[PDB]
Design a protein around this ligand. Structure first.
Ligand code: 0BU
Length: 476
């Protein structure tokens, strides 16, 4: 048996696949047998077995998601600009991050999310081999071998397992042009080496998730108010609202981001080896085949910081391009918030929104206007902009993130459970997450709260006073 070859969804085949088949099930269940309102969200499409519509096979849905990964890259920002931006960011993290002690193997092992899959090659939930303290059996071995390579600075090829995201989507993605977000399931060896190598940096960054613009690890409730307060110190506010962020990414940019992480790691030599592995053409298991994807971001959990960091680089570049001001001064005159593709940009500087949107499109990115029409707008009020699925709001007590009425109503119609074929089935039994749901409704005032409390009480089949619950969720 020789390696197969050819093309799969515009990408070169490199080998046979070891991946288990795509899930034809959803974790979502209705909360009442009643018919869903018009245009109400539902779990994403479940394949040929999906009772709701006749659409294509999941592999064909997946193949669609890979298409933009073969698309030509956009253009690199001007070298003169890349370098100054890069240097400014590196300097900024230098000045703000606390040096770390290396992450142990024990550490890296404890940090892994134990509920998700281990990926290539054992494809078993990480818990099946965990003992509260360490990995045993297969996963034990995979982890030990990977750890040995890391300490020796030896290269390992990450293998990724494609899957599609089980989530609530707007109806048009089920009944209209069918879509379902692609995920890259990293392998455990990689998860271990990445953990050891970059965990330290991820910690340092997280400790300063308020002074520095990478918001990963923040608490919306505890850190929202301070974070948005910093943003409101600046005249202009905007959100670029990217489409297909990960797929439109440049390895060239990711490598610059990766550098910064390598340079700012307690073991830069060992880190270097891991980063290069992470960024070399990616091997992606799509089921029958392992394909090679040269470009874009692998949608491995540690990459959120790398993603946020590229994001940082990209946005600073585009501004430096337009305003012709030093990245250092741009950062003096702005406040940023990045979480992967999600962003808020706040600045005093008069930004030529035309030249700015131009620049972003040229880097390969797909920013979209709030309205969706044919150049990005900017406001003098921070009220309206959103971050981490919440709407930024401001009152006499300060700023907070409020979950929108729709997301609340949507969380009432659906609950999570065991996997099943028919999302319209209701679940016998049932749920506290109903706790926090009453807290989100409080921040829309009383006359919206009573009606949410009405639906919450009637899920018995004390509901605290509005006064009481508004203060708890606002002020603690
Ligand atoms: O999957 C994608 N995009 C995607 C990515 C990759 C490829 C494709 C694709 O289809 N490519 C192609 C296919 C076929 C062909 S074809 O065969 O040729 O015809 C293509 C031909 C050509 S070409 O022209 O011929 O070259 C080119 C391409 S290309 O690749 O597109 O270039 C093709 C599409 N999006 C996606 C999917 C699923 C869920 C969600 C999702 O995010 N749900 C949500 C979750 C959470 C929140 S929340 O947390 O904020 O509440 C959400 C809030 C809101 S909000 O409240 O309204 O703001 C809304 C949603 S939403 O998504 O429900 O909208 C939310 C998003």
């Amino acid at each position: 048996l020789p390696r197969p070859s050819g093309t799969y969804a515009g990408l070169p085949i490199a080998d046979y696949g070891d991946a288990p088949p795509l899930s034809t099930k959803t974790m979502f269940w209705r909360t009442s047998p009643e018919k869903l309102p018009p245009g109400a969200w539902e779990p994403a499409y479940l394949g040929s077995k999906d009772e709701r519509v006749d659409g294509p096979s999941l592999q064909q849905v997946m193949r669609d998601q890979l298409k933009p990964y073969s698309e030509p890259r956009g253009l690199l920002p001007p070298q003169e600009i890349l370098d100054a931006v890069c240097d400014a960011i590196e300097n900024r993290l230098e000045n703000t991050l606390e040096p770390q002690k290396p992450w142990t193997f024990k550490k890296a092992c404890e940090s892994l999310d134990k509920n998700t899959s281990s990926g290539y090659p054992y494809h078993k939930q990480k818990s099946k081999d965990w003992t509260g303290s360490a990995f045993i059996g297969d996963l034990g071995d995979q982890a030990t071998h990977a750890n040995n390579m890391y300490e020796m600075g030896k290269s390992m090829r990450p293998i990724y397992t494609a899957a599609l995201k089980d989530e609530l989507v707007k109806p048009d993605k089920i009944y209209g042009k069918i879509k379902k977000r692609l995920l890259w399931g990293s392998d455990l060896g990689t998860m271990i080496r990445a953990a050891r190598a970059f965990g330290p940096f991820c910690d340092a960054l997280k400790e300063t998730c308020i002074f520095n613009p990478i918001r990963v690890g923040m608490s919306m409730n505890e850190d929202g108010p301070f974070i948005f307060a910093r943003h409101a110190n600046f005249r202009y506010h905007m959100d670029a609202d990217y489409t297909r962020w990960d797929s439109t990414q440049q390895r060239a940019i990711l490598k610059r981001a990766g550098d910064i992480m390598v340079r700012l790691s307690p073991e830069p030599d060992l880190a270097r080896v891991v980063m290069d592995d992470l960024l070399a053409p990616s091997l992606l298991d799509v089921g029958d085949y392992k394909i090679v994807v040269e470009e874009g971001l692998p949608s491995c959990p540690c990459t959120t910081q790398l993603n946020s960091l590229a994001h940082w680089i990209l946005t600073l570049c585009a501004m430096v391009e337009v305003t012709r001001v030093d990245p250092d001064i741009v950062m003096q005159e702005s406040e940023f918030s990045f979480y992967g593709d999600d962003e808020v940009v706040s600045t005093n500087l008069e930004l030529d929104m035309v030249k700015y949107t131009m620049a972003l499109r040229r880097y390969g990115l797909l920013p979209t206007r709030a309205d969706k029409e044919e150049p990005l707008e900017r406001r003098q009020t921070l009220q309206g902009i959103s971050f981490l699925r919440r709407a930024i709001v401001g009152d006499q007590f300060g700023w907070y993130g409020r979950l929108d009425r729709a997301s609340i109503d949507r969380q009432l119609l659906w609950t999570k459970g065991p996997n099943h074929q028919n999302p319209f089935e209701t679940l016998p039994g049932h749920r506290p997450q109903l706790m926090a749901l009453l807290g989100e409704a409080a921040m829309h005032g009383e006359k919206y709260y009573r009606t949410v409390a009405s639906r919450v009480s009637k899920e018995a089949a004390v509901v605290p006073r509005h006064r009481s619950v508004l203060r708890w969720v606002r002020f603690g």
